[model samples]
Target: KITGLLDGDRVIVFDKNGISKLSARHYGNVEGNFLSLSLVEALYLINLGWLEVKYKDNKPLSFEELYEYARNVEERLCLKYLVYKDLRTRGYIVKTGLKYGADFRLYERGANIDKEHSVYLVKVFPEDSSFLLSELTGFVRVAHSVRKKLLIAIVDADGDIVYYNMTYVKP
Candidate 1:
């Protein structure tokens, strides 16, 4: 249904997350290529300064601790480097969304430019359900009301994409 670039002897394509989320990944004979390039860039672009919960809490976390938590998630899905890098760059004062039911929440140190605050919802692109407009509308509404500023980025299968501005959702 889709095309993927090649890296060395490996192939790039959407990864069906356990059941249905469409993701991406690089397969065997891998070293570097378009797929990896796209992957790395995407990861950097979307995750750049973006914070996920767990590590954003008050308590400081060591690398060992973070990896241990990720271990609970499906091995193939929980990304190692991105998660590590995010935690590494973040500061101590950041409030994490442990019980809030959200993944990560980014806050501005001072003034609210344009609005009150900015928040982003990280959603995994579903690989199963037929594209629905209602779901998209809901996301937009949630983004508008939840926080002064909000972004919904859809992480694709390969775990290498962040589809912002509703780019991936079919109209």
Candidate 2:
């Protein structure tokens, strides 16, 4: 099982082998031999069934425990968790896209981000979610300026994710 130490709001895994696994899955930042995982990544690994996390007290946390911990740290935990889990299960590498004005930046399977830019910038919402036209246009503009496609991901009532690829056209 992969092991990690809970540090503040994140988990730090220090085994070279363990770090490699999380890095290969694009779950965290690899600094030398250590891997730093966000709350979402840690929970994902635990739920995937091979990871155990310990606090400073050295007790391992279960899924339900981790879930509660994560909820306390992140807002809109349910929606964010659902989207992140679904994307990872589909074999995509996802990272926070805060700088690019979106929810996530997506790298295709086996992509080396240092060599190739992310293929898409994703925005997630509920099925009935809406935004102002100006906001939508701004998202499109930012995506094209970075030469990445824009993908809108919505979670339907059934909790299934649907993707809509969008592009900007000059009128």
Candidate 3:
């Protein structure tokens, strides 16, 4: 089992095998001889039967426990989890897009971040969410300037997701 140590909203794994098998597989960020995984990624890895987490004094954490911890720490955990799970299942590598206030930047399958640009900037919205045209225009403009597509992922009350590609067109 790949071992990780809980560190607030993230986990740190120092083993080379763990780093390569877990972090380098897009579950976390590699730095120097170690790697860090977001709380969501850690829990997902646990559920996938690939990770085992321990707190201080080597206290093991279960998936349910981790979920509770994450719920307490993260806002909109369900929405984020749903979106992340769906994207990962479809073979996409996702990373935070907080720089643009978007939910994620999606890289193509088997593509490394250092070698290729992300193809899409994604914003996740609830079914009842409404949008401001100005905000959408801004999103389109930024996406165009960055040479990436803006994809709006709408999650229904039942947790189903539909994607809409946003683009700017001259009027």
Candidate 4:
């Protein structure tokens, strides 16, 4: 029963009517009493048959349409979205982790974000993607300093995803 407008890489909820309640539902972030849903989070709600999204021109968009726009807003968005949706389906709360040095901040199932905290900083990567071990080391360090674990999601070409925990160990 919520509607969102596409605003240059984000979905902003203009109506203040009970939008603040989204935070309680673990839907999106509440800022100054309004809700702002991220790209993948908006996509997840749209997929839940709970959200109606309008494009920049204010025209209502289908799931595939907004998905394309969201993808253009970032790299490997499909993989990210897949991992996000998968975790959500598993009942975990996913919050934006970009500022935290990961793709998402994951709360345990049934956690109250107002009183509790997330358990992991999750990074999403496609199966075929390659990167240096140093980057992984950095992510793990960040997660450790934040009092959480690093969870890496690997999405394959066929839309299947697998998860790995990158724990920082003393060697």
Candidate 5:
């Protein structure tokens, strides 16, 4: 089993096999000799049966424990994980998009981030969430300027999701 270590806001995989396997699938970022995975990624990785995690003393951390640890850092951990897992299950390579001020960056199936940029920016929200038109306009502008689609993923209380592709339009 791949050994995944818990780190602040991320997990670190230092084994050669673990690093290679995860990197081949664009699962995490290769930093030095280890791969750094976001909290969501790690959660999925564990659930996918590819990796096992430890807190300390070389003992494994239960899924619930890791979830608790990660949730302490992100209040919307469950929501983010659900959306993230859903996207990957649908065959999309999702990565963190905080650099672009979006929630997640979605790369096309055949695209490798080493060369190609993501084609879509995904912003996840709850079904009961509210939005500001001005704020919506800003995201549209950002997506247009960057040549990417702005996809809003709304997750309902029933754990269902729907997508709205917001674009910039002029009258």
Candidate 6:
């Protein structure tokens, strides 16, 4: 599927890597098995089974473990972009966090010090749905500690959304 682009009459072969980067938008079709077996199995066995389920006491996941399972880093930016869009709709001043390289920064002009501004960090990864709690809590702690607002977003199994399921963050 190689195509050439006429750039000032100079031919440029379409690079798949570049194409992937362009297509790797945070809120679009990221093809894969992003969800866990538990979700799929549950969906598959919706009506046909003598399915027995058991619950176990959960353990908190470490940040390292959470980062390991997360992926497609660009999606984080996409999620932040979505958040910025929302904030804008709500009449907030939103801009890219260029200095810190975060996804976005949100604040009401002259409303507070820069430290009180929101820094939306994007962490796009194919994460387990179950790990949402620990990750969100850790983010909340970090954000509140610095007086920076945090919106931790996850790209669900669908891999094409910014806020779907949204990890249901408490803060």
**TM-scores for all candidates?**
0.34, 0.87, 0.88, 0.86, 0.92, 0.32
Q: Write one digit per residue (lDDT tens) for candidate 6, span 41-139.
A: 121122123122222223422323222222223334334434444554555555554444344555663344335655454333344555656655555
Clashes of each: 9, 0, 0, 0, 0, 1
Estimate, for each residue in 84-143, the C-alpha lDDT of model 5 and write its tens digit.
999999889998878777889998876768788898898788888787777667777888
Question: What's the best-to-worst order under TM-score?
Answer: 5, 3, 2, 4, 1, 6
Alpha carbon lDDT of each predicted model? 0.36, 0.83, 0.84, 0.83, 0.85, 0.37
Candidate 4, after superposition: displacement of residue 143 in Å? 2.1
| Model 2 Cα lDDT, one tens digit per residue, 42-81 | 8888998868999867789988888888888787566677
Worst 10 residues of 1 by lDDT: 18-27
C-alpha positional error of residue 169 in candidate 5 after TM-score superposition, expressed in Å: 3.5
Q: What is the C-alpha RMSD of each candidate to the true structure, in Å?
A: 17.6, 2.1, 2.0, 2.3, 1.5, 17.7
> Mind giving the per-residue lDDT tens digits that candidate 3 earns over 26-115?
789889679999988888889898988988767679998888888899987777877888898899998887877788889988997888
| Poorly placed runs, candidate 2 (over 4 Å) | 128-131, 167-171
Model 5 misplaced regions, further than 4 Å: none
Among all candidates shown, the one with the greatest lDDT: 5
Query: Could you tell me how far off, in angstroms, the CA of residue 86 lies in candidate 5 after the best superposition?
Result: 1.0
Give model 2's TM-score versus the native structure: 0.87
Best by TM-score: 5
**lDDT digits (tens) for residues 87-110 of candidate 1:** 324431122232333333444444
